[PDB]
Amino acid sequence: LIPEIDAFLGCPTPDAWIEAALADQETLLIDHKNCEFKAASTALSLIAKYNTHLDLINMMSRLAREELVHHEQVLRLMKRRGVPLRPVSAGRYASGLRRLVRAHEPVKLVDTLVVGAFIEARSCERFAALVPHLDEELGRFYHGLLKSEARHYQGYLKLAHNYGDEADIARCVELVRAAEMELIQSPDQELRFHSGIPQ
Amino acid sequence: IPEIDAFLGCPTPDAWIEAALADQETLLIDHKNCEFKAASTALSLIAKYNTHLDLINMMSRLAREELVHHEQVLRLMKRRGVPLRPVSAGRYASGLRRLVRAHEPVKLVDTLVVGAFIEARSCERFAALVPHLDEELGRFYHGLLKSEARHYQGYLKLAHNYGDEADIARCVELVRAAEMELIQSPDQELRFHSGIPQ
Ligand SMILES: [O-][O-]
Ligand SMILES: [Fe+3]
Ligand SMILES: [Fe+3]
Ligand SMILES: [Fe+3]
Ligand SMILES: [Fe+3]
């Protein structure tokens, strides 16, 4: 398969989420820094767990390097804007999606790779949603991250097909799409980069 | 920052080289795993010392280089039909981690000094092997020397942000003695940082 990001996601970022993000951009930016690092950390955990899946290892090693660069780019921007390293707790999103990962191998891996495609897919969509509302410096940076995010999305789907069956993958995608949109549109008590709508 | 030769207490023993040369498949696979654990350890430090800006910047870059090394070893493996055979971790790194004190900032000091030692030893050990390997592999290993030397220097420079000059020197004295004992003591497995046979 491997479709366009707009067709993969079940909904766009709500306007109510954007309004919350614009009114607390510093929290956003720090969380973002954190997301880029978690993505690298998760990538390395996949390599340790699936330590005989050669294509996954090579892809995850590269993805982690790329995510670290993102991490460093956000830090460089935080510095330029005088944004300190203050603690911001992990949002609910990723753990929410991981509750959908099946129990047994080899389908557990497939679901794990699909969730990664959704996280990347969502990030790309949300960066795109924000760009028009941000200042030039931050908007230009976010716009540049879109293409990496799409590349990461495609990478997870390609791994999925490599280790999974066409129809199983299509069903998984359908089920993760529903749970993801619920995490995105449901109320949330905090503002994170992948939070729901703050109430 | 002293030269790597002055930093280590001993060179790599002959019996280790002879064993390494006789099982280059285990050598390569374990080396690949060390590059991976070097990256993993760097991200772990970042998570742990997440407000130390110089530290996170240095470890972020270091992790990225280790992941290139990992990818490099894997490509060499594929070319030579060396499979992804699971290989258990050796004792060296956990042996050195026992030296780490429990309270900050000396915990971090000890941690960084240990990092410098691992890197310095890898640099010395690649060097000791180079003249005995096939051309391609030997030149690849020579090329990693410069990199490990920079990692060694980074760890040690960073350690100087957390302990005065005499305290870091004392830390280094103690870690050197321990590292040498790990390198020269009998070991049953062959691993990149394993000891000697029997
Ligand atoms: O950030 O993925
Ligand atoms: Fe990223
Ligand atoms: Fe990504
Ligand atoms: Fe390395
Ligand atoms: Fe290194």
Curated annotation (Swiss-Prot), chain B:
Pathway: tRNA modification; 2-methylthio-N-6-(cis-hydroxy)isopentenyl adenosine-tRNA biosynthesis. Changing R97E: Loss of activity. It is an enzyme of class 1 (oxidoreductase). Fe cation 1 binds at E35, E66, H69. Its cofactor is Fe cation. InterPro entries: Ferritin-like (IPR012347), Ferritin-like_SF (IPR009078), tRNA-Hydrxlase_MiaE (IPR010386). Changing K37D: Loss of activity. One of its GO terms (biological process) is tRNA modification. Keywords: Iron, Metal-binding, Monooxygenase, Oxidoreductase, tRNA processing. Its EC number is 1.14.99.69. Gene3D superfamilies: 1.20.1260.10. Involved in specific tRNA modification. Catalyzes the oxygen-dependent hydroxylation of 2-methylthio-N-6-isopentenyl adenosine (ms2i6A) to produce 2-methylthio-N-6-(cis-hydroxy)isopentenyl adenosine (ms2io6A) at position 37 in tRNAs. PANTHER family: TRNA 2-(METHYLSULFANYL)-N(6)-ISOPENTENYLADENOSINE(37) HYDROXYLASE (PTHR42637:SF1), TRNA-(MS[2]IO[6]A)-HYDROXYLASE (PTHR42637). This is tRNA 2-(methylsulfanyl)-N(6)-isopentenyladenosine(37) hydroxylase. It comes from Pseudomonas putida (strain ATCC 47054 / DSM 6125 / CFBP 8728 / NCIMB 11950 / KT2440). The gene is miaE.
